[PDB]
Design a protein around this nucleic acid. Structure first.
Ligand SMILES: [Cl-]
Ligand SMILES: [Cl-]
Ligand SMILES: [Cl-]
Ligand SMILES: [Cl-]
Ligand SMILES: [Cl-]
Ligand SMILES: [Cl-]
Ligand SMILES: [Cl-]
Ligand SMILES: [K+]
Ligand SMILES: [Mg+2]
Ligand SMILES: [Mg+2]
Ligand SMILES: [Mg+2]
Ligand SMILES: [Mg+2]
Ligand SMILES: [Mg+2]
Ligand SMILES: [Mg+2]
Ligand SMILES: [Mg+2]
Ligand SMILES: [Mg+2]
Ligand SMILES: [Mg+2]
Ligand SMILES: [Mg+2]
Ligand SMILES: [Mg+2]
Ligand SMILES: [Mg+2]
Ligand SMILES: [Mg+2]
Ligand SMILES: [Mg+2]
Ligand SMILES: [Mg+2]
Ligand SMILES: [Mg+2]
Ligand SMILES: [Mg+2]
Ligand SMILES: [Mg+2]
Ligand SMILES: [Mg+2]
Ligand SMILES: [Mg+2]
Ligand SMILES: [Mg+2]
Ligand SMILES: [Mg+2]
Ligand SMILES: [Mg+2]
Ligand SMILES: [Mg+2]
Ligand SMILES: [Mg+2]
Ligand SMILES: [Mg+2]
Ligand code: NA
Ligand code: NA
Ligand code: NA
Ligand code: NA
Ligand code: NA
Ligand code: NA
Ligand code: NA
Ligand code: NA
Ligand code: NA
Ligand code: NA
Ligand code: NA
Ligand code: NA
Ligand code: NA
Ligand code: NA
Ligand code: NA
Ligand code: NA
Ligand code: NA
Ligand code: NA
Ligand code: NA
Ligand code: NA
Ligand code: NA
Ligand code: NA
Lengths: 142, 132, 156, 337, 172
RNA sequence: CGCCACACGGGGUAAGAGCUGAACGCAUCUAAGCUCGAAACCCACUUGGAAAAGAGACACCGCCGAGGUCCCGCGUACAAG
RNA sequence: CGAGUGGCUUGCUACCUCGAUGUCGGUUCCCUCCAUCCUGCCCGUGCAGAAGCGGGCAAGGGUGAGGUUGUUCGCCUAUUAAAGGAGGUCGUGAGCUGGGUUUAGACCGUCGUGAGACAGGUCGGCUGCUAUCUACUGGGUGUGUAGGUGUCUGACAAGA
RNA sequence: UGUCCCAACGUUGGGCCCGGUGAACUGUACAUUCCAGUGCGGAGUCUGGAGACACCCAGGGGGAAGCGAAGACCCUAUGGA
RNA sequence: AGCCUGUGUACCAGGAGGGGAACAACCCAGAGAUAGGUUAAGGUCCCCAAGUGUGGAUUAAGUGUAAUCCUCUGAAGGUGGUCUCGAGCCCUAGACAGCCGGGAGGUGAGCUUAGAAGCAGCUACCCUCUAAGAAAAGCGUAACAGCUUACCGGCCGAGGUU
């Protein structure tokens, strides 16, 4: 609820990792960022394998635990954490001043970062974060 | 198998020595197995009323002794619950030697028999003197 | 025993029979097959060319040679062709069959050393290459990957 | 060779800790099929006695004959839906929107809540209806509560509150239905929801037994043979293998046993009556005498005498309902002796 | 590459984005034609399948799009039909169409009826021991036929002995 | 040792059975697309779960007073708590 | 004949420990692997059916009770859908047991001049410790979220 | 015949809370760990990740190659008896 | 064999610092203090200093993002997955494929054999009509029939085949 994002990024039809990479780089420069339409972000690859990885991540674990998100919500955020030294003071700060949302709760339309967009016309081997989540068993709350 | 029309508490185990309620020449029986039964680690295979068991002849005529025959549990000392909530228990544990087709190897059945046994083994039943 | 035990050319040359005894006999039956009465007067001459220096146990040779010749009976027991295995198992081989104490092994067999690109087998045939098939079955029983090469034959 | 054997106890009811609310909280509700209606009701366990019935089962070779059934008696006096709570769908699941309360409150509902003195029923009702219009209205449920005072055998007067979902035809039709119920005084009865012969899922916090050993807590064996005389009798062989070098949570250990919530599926409602017909001579042991609205549930029911139990129309029944079973006899013989 | 398909006078074909719809006296069929760098467009009188690449995988699809479209043309006009013949040896097999799904009863003495749901606007008209599956959508139809035949599939016993079942008699 | 209760059904797949279909006019279950299909996978169901640091939501009561601790009689609870 | 995978068997090596990392078997209790014995779905058949045989996916669940032997293994019996195998310090002695191995007593056989020996057999022959840390099972007290009561949500977690 | 199937309940002394009395073993340091990897090839401390708010009570002992004993086995000593 | 035993040499031992995730001996590098600068190995999407650098091509397997190595496996054998380069032959006198039509007669050749008629076996394999058409390449029949290959013509239209 209410997040003064100096920058709002739209992930729709954007390569998750390429977005995450830049979103990290900015948050570490002190920028408050909000990622919008997570459920519509995409990651290239053969769907079947891609789901095997993510599914393997949900299954990993023991008493100590290995909490892995199922919602395209977390998925994106965990993807971004992996690009920040989240256990240092600086990093945790940069990670906390960032937020990912399902769809868009703002009025403004997010911008599209350069080099993160995927042309659906010249591309068929890719997957939607949402699609991934539905397989993992999440609750399509979007 | 067909529903016995009752709830049974297996009063017998493998190794158990019961009475041979018939005139086959077999006096005593030794329970060796229980048809269709699979227990659990450490659990002694249990057999009760209306169960078709495999047996070995402990006491009787020389030619009947040591033979591995099949049979049916006709009576037990441990109580059995009938549809109306009553309990029924007998004076001993006895069974009757039977064949491949489940027909009594003998001619006559000595002593009483639980009605329930009828609903599973006709010929055995239709061979009974007293059916409680 | 496995080929992995003697397929490499990493030991010195061990061939002097004047200093070796107890050499098992070669399992290889013949080196000249087909019409050995006639000479290489054939139109077509294909060759089985090995692609990596290796050692080939007389075991492998016999099995590789039979499999091809035995198969070259798509042409008849007295067919018109001449088959040739130009290598002989000279290199003697041992095995240490005490642990590593006094481990110089005891002669257990012989193997022929083939360098990569040499032709181990040569067949002569008129435009009737069933031979090309006799060799897909031969390099099937030798360690190395092989090249089936045709020399005099532009009747493609 | 080491024979195989299934692990001891289930890992589906854990952790095995004391329950948060002595009052049960369903985490699943029936499907919205028939007409609008409250999907639940409660009461207080009293005890057990048997009843003779007419084989009702059509596929039974005994259908039509006598048959003794064990029944747990449950005092199910009326309850009161004091409010209608609305939930809105959101990117993060369902969230409570607002509530519609009443003014008529049971004399002693303030022993638990801070009863409303100023509430705007219509604004609430409006807010909801504007949500529905926008189509962000999530399911609808009623804040209800019991009247322990109606039950003499139960010492408490402080009411037990619990939210219960209302399933009905259209959302609009059941929204209204809800409001109607609340507005009155919220007063409803077991008859208004269940009918004898139907199946219901009975929730409730089991009987507590404090800390217990693995043998009883998980059903692991006792030490056998000579092993039982050596200084170990009811302790398990080992807490695990050398590696991994840690004790895995799946290994049976001592702990809090009992007083856990349990939702017991497909219980048949043998009869819903009123009076003292089911009561036993001398009085139900450690409970008292029954004489008012009650229910007769087949079999057993989690929890100890006096505990609040919760009913719900079975969510996954196996049989078809065979309404109003003929009861030829109910035993009133003393539960003492 | 670029292929041009002249649409039949009997037909109208429109297309927005990756979806193509063809309408004729026999009906309308829409299809998604999506493949890397392959543009499909309705140029007034002709449908054009074009791409800037020529590697085998592309040409492969191009050809697939072509036939796909032509099959649409054919469907909205002449249509598609598959002929089928119910056949039994001992148990009279009863095939009826009930709702949007054909039902087969008493198959091999079976008490439990066997059924399958028809696909799309496919008509399964049954007359005696003959069936006729028809529709403007070849995909739907072809599958409806196939399913029907599959519905009497048998694995448990010898097929050469147990031949009961409905089979495709005539392929469009 | 007694008694009661413990699904089905959806969704996506493996092997596999097929549809449409090209590269390769034909053919082809696959390359693009699609129909089906395992006790296995997801959901369903039970149980735990605001310490989920994005540390939640709602209603009412209260901020000089709402509610709570101690106190007293007891347990549907309990090794202390 | 040729190419491999595994790390259950056996051997090789002598890297790790001789100011000690308690032995074999069993037992108890927990997790796993698939190269699948049963159970589900399939393909082939020298597939009529029934019963099989071979093969593919699949590790969710199951895989039990006994007679001789310290045995692992294995032999044997009767049941069984089937009575699969393997890893976890040949899992598991700050858990058990102590039959075997492997002390001191003693016998027999073989060897030895002898003391005495045995990769032979045999009878007898001991199982320590109050848990600091960590781990987990359950149970509390605080602090953070920032006045109270009641009712929930559900990120995720467990299940056979 | 409770050795077992298969465990139950009960009795007494402890155990748990309170008053009083009041040790010892052990301790290079640090220490909330888990999954992998690496390393003299058997890591709470290295490396990568995961998890982890602090304190306390009881428990049964998985790990600290836990504590206890300069290894009794084996070899070596121009050792001893 | 992270085995045993030589040899030459450089290193560790006794060698810091930079890189390699960590890691005696692999890469740079041999190092008094402090200071500024420029590089070496290695690296430039983020974690993380520096390119989401340029021209061009391949790969769809997450292959791969792994110099060396106990450490990074992957082999013989297979692939109309795809890209590139070459050679021979055929083709608008119409190729390659598909579809249509034709596939005739002497004659069901002789011989054997009850029988055999393209097709059990043996021998031969001749000429007519024609734009084609075997004394028949594969099925099929008890033997016939029937179904097709070879061979010819048509439709079609561009490259095709090895
Ligand atoms: Cl976990
Ligand atoms: Cl970090
Ligand atoms: Cl693509
Ligand atoms: Cl048995
Ligand atoms: Cl034990
Ligand atoms: Cl120097
Ligand atoms: Cl990946
Ligand atoms: K040692
Ligand atoms: Mg046992
Ligand atoms: Mg003891
Ligand atoms: Mg009583
Ligand atoms: Mg009584
Ligand atoms: Mg069969
Ligand atoms: Mg130890
Ligand atoms: Mg497998
Ligand atoms: Mg498992
Ligand atoms: Mg035993
Ligand atoms: Mg061990
Ligand atoms: Mg074990
Ligand atoms: Mg010990
Ligand atoms: Mg231990
Ligand atoms: Mg101890
Ligand atoms: Mg002993
Ligand atoms: Mg002994
Ligand atoms: Mg002894
Ligand atoms: Mg703080
Ligand atoms: Mg770390
Ligand atoms: Mg020493
Ligand atoms: Mg000694
Ligand atoms: Mg001396
Ligand atoms: Mg030194
Ligand atoms: Mg930077
Ligand atoms: Mg890889
Ligand atoms: Mg390499
Ligand atoms: Na990707
Ligand atoms: Na996980
Ligand atoms: Na020696
Ligand atoms: Na080879
Ligand atoms: Na003891
Ligand atoms: Na004792
Ligand atoms: Na140990
Ligand atoms: Na399914
Ligand atoms: Na909170
Ligand atoms: Na290997
Ligand atoms: Na080994
Ligand atoms: Na030591
Ligand atoms: Na042991
Ligand atoms: Na399994
Ligand atoms: Na045994
Ligand atoms: Na032991
Ligand atoms: Na011990
Ligand atoms: Na006792
Ligand atoms: Na421990
Ligand atoms: Na040096
Ligand atoms: Na380094
Ligand atoms: Na990868």
């Amino acid at each position: 609820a209410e997040f003064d994002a100096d920058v709002i990024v739209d992930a729709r039809d954007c390569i998750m990792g390429r977005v995450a990479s830049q979103v990290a780089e900015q948050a570490l420069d002190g920028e408050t960022v909000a990622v919008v339409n997570a459920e519509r972000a995409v990651i290239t690859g053969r769907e079947e394998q891609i789901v095997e990885k993510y599914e393997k991540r949900v299954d990993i674990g023991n008493d100590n635990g290995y909490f892995y998100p199922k919602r395209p919500d977390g998925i994106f955020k965990r993807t971004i954490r992996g690009m920040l030294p989240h256990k240092k003071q600086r990093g945790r700060e940069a990670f906390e001043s960032v937020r990912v949302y399902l769809g868009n709760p703002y009025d403004e339309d997010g911008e599209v970062l350069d080099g993160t967009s995927l042309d659906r016309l010249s591309n068929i081997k890719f997957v939607t974060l949402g699609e991934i989540s539905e397989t993992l068993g999440a609750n399509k709350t979007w | 198998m067909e529903a016995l029309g009752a709830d049974v508490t297996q009063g017998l185990e493998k190794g158990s020595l019961i009475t041979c309620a018939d005139n086959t020449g077999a006096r005593e029986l030794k329970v060796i197995s229980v048809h269709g039964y699979s227990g659990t680690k450490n659990r002694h295979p249990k057999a009760g009323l209306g169960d078709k068991i495999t047996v070995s002849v402990t006491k009787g005529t020389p030619e009947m002794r040591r033979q591995v025959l099949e049979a049916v549990v006709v009576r037990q000392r441990k109580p059995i619950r009938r549809p109306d909530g009553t309990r029924v228990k007998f004076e001993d544990n006895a069974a009757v030697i039977v064949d491949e087709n489940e027909d009594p190897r003998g001619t006559e059945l000595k002593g009483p028999i639980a009605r329930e046994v009828a609903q599973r083994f006709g010929s055995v039943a239709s061979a009974a003197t007293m059916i409680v | 025993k496995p080929g992995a035990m003697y397929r490499n050319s990493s030991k010195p040359a061990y061939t002097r029979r004047e200093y070796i005894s107890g050499i098992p006999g070669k399992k290889i039956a013949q080196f000249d097959m087909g019409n050995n009465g006639a000479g290489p007067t054939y139109p077509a001459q294909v060759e089985l060319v090995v692609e990596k220096p290796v050692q080939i146990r007389h075991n492998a040779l016999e099995a590789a040679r039979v499999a091809a010749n035995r198969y070259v009976q798509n042409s008849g027991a007295a067919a018109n062709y001449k088959f040739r295995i130009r290598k002989f198992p000279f290199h003697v081989i041992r095995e240490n069959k005490d642990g590593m104490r006094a481990p110089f092994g005891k002669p257990v067999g012989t193997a022929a050393r083939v360098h990569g690109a040499n032709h181990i087998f040569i067949a002569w045939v008129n435009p009737d290459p069933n031979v090309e098939e006799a060799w897909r079955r031969a390099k099937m029983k030798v360690t190395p990957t092989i090249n089936i090469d045709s020399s005099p034959a532009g009747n493609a | 060779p080491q024979p195989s054997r299934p692990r001891k106890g289930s890992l589906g009811f854990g952790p095995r800790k004391r329950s948060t609310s002595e009052t049960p909280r369903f985490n699943s509700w029936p499907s919205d099929d028939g007409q609008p209606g409250v999907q639940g009701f409660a009461g207080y366990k009293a005890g057990m006695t048997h009843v003779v019935l007419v084989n009702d089962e059509p596929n039974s070779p005994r259908e039509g004959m006598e048959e003794t059934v064990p029944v747990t008696v449950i005092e199910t006096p009326p309850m009161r839906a004091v409010a209608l709570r609305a939930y809105e769908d959101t990117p993060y699941g369902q969230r409570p929107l607002t509530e519609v309360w009443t003014d008529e409150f049971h004399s002693e509902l303030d022993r638990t809540l801070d009863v409303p003195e100023d509430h705007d029923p219509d604004a609430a009702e409006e807010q909801i209806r504007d949500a529905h219009e926008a189509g962000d209205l999530g399911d609808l449920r009623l804040i209800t509560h019991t009247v322990p005072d109606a039950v003499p055998s139960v010492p408490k007067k402080k009411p037990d509150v619990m939210e219960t979902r209302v399933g009905g035809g259209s959302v609009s039709d059941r929204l209204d239905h809800a409001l109607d119920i609340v507005e009155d005084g919220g007063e409803h009865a077991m008859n208004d929801i269940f009918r004898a012969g139907e199946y219901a899922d009975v929730a409730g916090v089991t009987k507590g037994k404090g800390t217990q050993g693995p043998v009883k807590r998980w059903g692991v064996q006792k030490r056998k043979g000579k092993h039982a005389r050596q200084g170990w009798r009811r302790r398990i062989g080992n807490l695990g293998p050398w590696n991994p070098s840690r004790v895995r949570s799946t290994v049976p250990q001592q702990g809090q046993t009992g007083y856990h919530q349990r939702t017991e599926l497909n219980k048949r409602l043998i009869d819903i009556g009123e009076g003292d017909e089911p009561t036993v001579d001398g009085g139900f042991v450690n409970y008292g005498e029954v004489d008012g609205p009650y229910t007769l549930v087949k079999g057993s029911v989690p929890g100890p005498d006096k505990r609040l139990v919760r009913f719900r129309p079975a969510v996954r029944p196996n049989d078809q309902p065979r309404l109003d079973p003929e009861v030829r006899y109910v035993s009133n013989e003393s539960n003492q002796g | 590459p670029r292929v041009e398909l002249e649409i039949p006078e009997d037909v109208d074909a429109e297309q927005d984005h990756l979806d193509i719809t063809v309408e004729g006296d026999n009906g309308s069929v829409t299809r998604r034609l999506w493949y890397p760098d392959i543009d499909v467009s309705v140029d007034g009188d002709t449908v054009v399948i074009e791409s800037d690449e020529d590697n085998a995988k592309t040409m492969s699809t191009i050809g697939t799009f072509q036939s796909h479209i032509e099959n649409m043309f054919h469907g909205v006009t002449e249509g598609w039909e598959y002929g089928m013949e119910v056949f039994y040896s001992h148990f009279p097999m009863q095939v009826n169409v009930e709702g949007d799904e054909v039902v087969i009863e008493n198959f091999l003495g079976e008490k439990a009826p066997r059924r399958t749901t028809i696909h799309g606007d496919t008509d399964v008209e049954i007359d005696g021991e003959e069936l006729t599956v028809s529709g403007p959508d070849i995909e739907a139809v072809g599958q409806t036929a196939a399913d029907i035949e599959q519905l009497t599939r048998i694995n448990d016993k010898d097929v050469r002995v147990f031949q009961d079942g409905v089979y495709i008699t005539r392929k469009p």
